[PDB]
């Protein structure tokens, strides 16, 4: 009756529970659209199931913490796509080719000494 996946992006972690139904979606105690209200980035989160037509087929209970809304959005995108592969193993094809099943390791590069930021160097006047 329940289906699960773990999404991570940057510093955001999302626990997502897929349970069949009509499509209601909840993030941390609120509707999807309540929590991501005013964010174009949002509907990208529901993209894995749109790939396998599970759009309206599932309700989703979802936790989210750490990072920021966009990273959280990307985290969700991952987990619910793990949940789908879990809900059906043959879902891998038509999910892996969209690279929805992979986690990007791109995170904040550390601040280095001698620099102003990670790579931004201090301005020098040779002469």
């Amino acid at each position: 009756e329940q289906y699960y996946g773990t999404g991570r992006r940057k510093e955001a972690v999302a626990r997502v529970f897929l349970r069949p139904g009509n499509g209601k979606v909840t993030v941390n105690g609120q509707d999807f659209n309540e929590y991501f209200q005013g964010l174009v980035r949002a509907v990208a989160a529901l993209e894995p199931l749109r790939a396998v037509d599970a759009l309206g087929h599932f309700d989703a209970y979802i936790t989210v913490r750490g990072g920021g809304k966009s990273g959280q959005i990307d985290a969700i995108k991952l987990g619910i796509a793990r949940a789908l592969v879990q809900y059906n193993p043959d879902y891998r094809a038509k999910l892996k080719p969209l690279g929805f099943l992979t986690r990007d390791a791109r995170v904040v590069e550390r601040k280095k000494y001698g620099k102003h930021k990670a790579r931004r160097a201090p301005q020098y006047s040779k002469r």
Partner: protein, 155 residues
Amino acid sequence: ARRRRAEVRQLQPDLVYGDVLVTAFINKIMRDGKKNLAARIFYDACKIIQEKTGQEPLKVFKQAVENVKPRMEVRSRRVGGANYQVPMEVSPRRQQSLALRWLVQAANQRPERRAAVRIAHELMDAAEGKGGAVKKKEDVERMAEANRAYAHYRW
């Protein structure tokens, strides 16, 4: 760079129209990494051009792009003791970049007070073949033809 021909970043298709070209345009609008702002401005503009002229915004946008693409450009090359403006064909990748760049820049030289509006209207003129954006393209091309004589210096 020196070693290899770099890899063109594949963009993620935009949420509203599913378009890599739209995404690219958004980023060009985007100042200070405020993409939400950037997204609104375009989509707001997409709303406006529909009100003013009832068509498909996507169709307008894409038509405006094809109109600002320089097919030929000049690139300098100092041959001997003089810098010749050599006429060159523009790669399709570069045609795109210049088109989207000039579109936004010309947009933001316009007098009306809101960005979405400027972005709207410039896309309307460029679609019809008017506006500073197309003027840029026309000019770049004219420079190239003007120096057709140096087209054998092409590398």
